[PDB]
Scaffold this active site. Structure first.
Site, short mmCIF file in Angstrom:
data_model
loop_
_atom_site.label_atom_id
_atom_site.label_comp_id
_atom_site.label_asym_id
_atom_site.label_seq_id
_atom_site.Cartn_x
_atom_site.Cartn_y
_atom_site.Cartn_z
N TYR A 184 -11.01 13.87 -3.57
CA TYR A 184 -10.11 13.72 -4.71
C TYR A 184 -9.52 15.06 -5.12
O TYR A 184 -8.32 15.16 -5.40
CB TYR A 184 -10.85 13.07 -5.88
CG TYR A 184 -10.01 12.80 -7.10
CD1 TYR A 184 -9.21 11.66 -7.18
CD2 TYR A 184 -10.01 13.67 -8.19
CE1 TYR A 184 -8.44 11.40 -8.31
CE2 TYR A 184 -9.25 13.41 -9.31
CZ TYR A 184 -8.46 12.28 -9.37
OH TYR A 184 -7.70 12.02 -10.48
N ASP B 255 0.84 -1.19 0.00
CA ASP B 255 0.00 0.00 0.00
C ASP B 255 0.88 1.24 0.00
O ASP B 255 1.66 1.46 0.94
CB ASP B 255 -0.92 -0.02 1.22
CG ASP B 255 -1.96 1.08 1.20
OD1 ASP B 255 -1.98 1.88 0.24
OD2 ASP B 255 -2.76 1.15 2.15
N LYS C 58 -5.50 16.09 -4.89
CA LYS C 58 -4.81 16.47 -6.12
C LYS C 58 -4.26 17.89 -6.05
O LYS C 58 -3.19 18.16 -6.62
CB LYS C 58 -5.76 16.33 -7.31
CG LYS C 58 -6.08 14.89 -7.68
CD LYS C 58 -4.82 14.05 -7.73
CE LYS C 58 -5.05 12.74 -8.46
NZ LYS C 58 -3.81 11.92 -8.54
N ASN D 86 1.78 7.71 -9.30
CA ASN D 86 0.57 7.54 -10.09
C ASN D 86 -0.56 6.81 -9.38
O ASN D 86 -1.72 7.00 -9.76
CB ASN D 86 0.90 6.81 -11.40
CG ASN D 86 -0.34 6.52 -12.24
OD1 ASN D 86 -0.89 5.42 -12.20
ND2 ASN D 86 -0.78 7.51 -13.00
#
Lengths: 272, 268
Positions: A167, A68, A171, A94
């Site tokens: 998210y 992980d 980001k 990524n």
């Protein structure tokens, strides 16, 4: 040059999808790729076979570390496997998950999980690579080192979509994390840059993103540091830093509360 | 510019910005729920400094706890509802664990992210669910809600010794953008302030926080403001600097490297 022979690269989330396409693209330029994903995702695919096929096609090899990416032990193992192969030159953060939910319905786990994999996973590998590259620059004649860092943000971090607060927050943090990396390591030959990809001849093929990552991992990108790119299809878009829209300077030493209220209320009067 | 009969929650209000922010709200008549860690609340007189602001007819309550924990955001929402509702939320609590990126430990990163980013999320999400439920039960379908979150210019610059600070503040901006889109239809306004910490006095931020918490800011949503003394700067969204389109339907990896290497050779 475009060749990556004798260079060690680490790619996370490389079991399938975009991370796999990137890992194939690096090993195909001669790079020795250390592919990372969860042991489950690595077993269900054969990327470690499709690579080392393509890597030993071009002289390199390929190991596969499972774990992980949000765990410190995985980032430590990735750095260890790279150093055992000769060193560390390229890192492509990524790996990522999503837990979409309207903000007022989003649970703590949905927020924490996305932040851990994206943001903390990026930090652990970025910090480890920063520590390695800084140290190897201390022991290098010339005080420099070849280093390439490619972190994966998203256009969600700029727009803040509905149902993707987690998210978008991760980001946006990845971009800010990478800007610090570029500012801290740029004086020693390391290049850290951000890609905001969209991936599915196909106008959404991951090969559109891979060709940009291949540049950002090559020595030809030596003058590319701290930049943010949006890439999908046959286009690469360089994002500019945020600018100021309007300056509200007071006619004194400090803004009067009602004076400021009048100015801002009037500016946003015809607002869509 | 009059918050009489409204209930506000301010975090990190023991001293610094949060105290000045919570003082400015209480002077406008707003009931203020003051939150900081027990030790910071103890060494501070902010309970009685804001409690004595009833001179504009409202009270002040203290709730101690770590804002990065779900139980704290739960007790803050329960306290405001116990006072009659939740109208204003000022997310301000934060710490700094500065360190060069190649020397930064996991704890130094996790701590800044937890207090800044998670603490903002926990109280933002609690306020979002409350305002959304309150709006569906309202016969007009709307509710008065003001969300003021605190980011920093560090999120735009990425300082060398504040990677944890810059990332938390950048995520806070994106979190507030999602909150603005998700709640603006319900009459909630969610905006961001970027303070610089006398041009660095906390009272330079209070004037804007008082506006962003007032009904006068009803047409201000999803905006990011930078505050530096007498200057209030509205940040525009990032634009595209240059697009590189390939001739045909696919980049040749070599024509792409040539296009980018030439563009960056002569660009300061």
């Amino acid at each position: 040059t475009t060749d990556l022979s004798g260079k060690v690269a680490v790619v996370t989330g490389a079991a399938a999808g975009l991370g796999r396409a990137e890992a194939l693209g690096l090993a195909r330029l001669g790079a020795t790729v250390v592919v990372n994903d969860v042991a489950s995702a690595l077993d269900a695919s054969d990327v470690v076979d499709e690579i080392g096929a393509a890597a030993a096609d071009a002289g390199a090899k390929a190991v596969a570390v499972a774990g992980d990416i949000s765990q410190r032990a995985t980032a430590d193992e990735l750095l260890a496997s790279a150093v055992g192969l000769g060193g560390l030159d390229i890192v492509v953060n990524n790996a990522g998950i999503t837990r979409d939910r309207m903000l007022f319905n989003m649970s703590d786990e949905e927020w924490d999980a996305v932040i851990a994999v994206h943001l903390r996973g990026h930090f652990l590998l970025t910090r480890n690579a920063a520590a390695y590259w800084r140290d190897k620059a201390k022991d290098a004649e010339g005080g420099s080192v070849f280093g390439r860092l490619v972190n994966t943000s998203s256009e969600a971090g700029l727009v803040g979509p509905v149902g993707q607060a987690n998210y978008a927050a991760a980001k946006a943090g990845i971009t800010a994390l990478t800007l610090s990396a570029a500012r801290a390591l740029g004086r020693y030959g390391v290049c850290a840059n951000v890609i905001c990809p969209r991936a599915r001849i196909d106008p959404l093929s991951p090969q559109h993103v891979v060709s940009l990552v291949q540049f950002l991992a090559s020595p030809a990108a030596a003058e590319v540091n701290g930049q943010v790119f949006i890439v999908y299809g046959p286009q690469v878009t360089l994002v500019s830093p945020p600018h100021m829209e309007r300056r509200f300077s007071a006619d004194g030493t400090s803004w009067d509360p009602t004076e400021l209220t009048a100015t801002l209320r009037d500016y946003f009067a015809g607002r869509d």
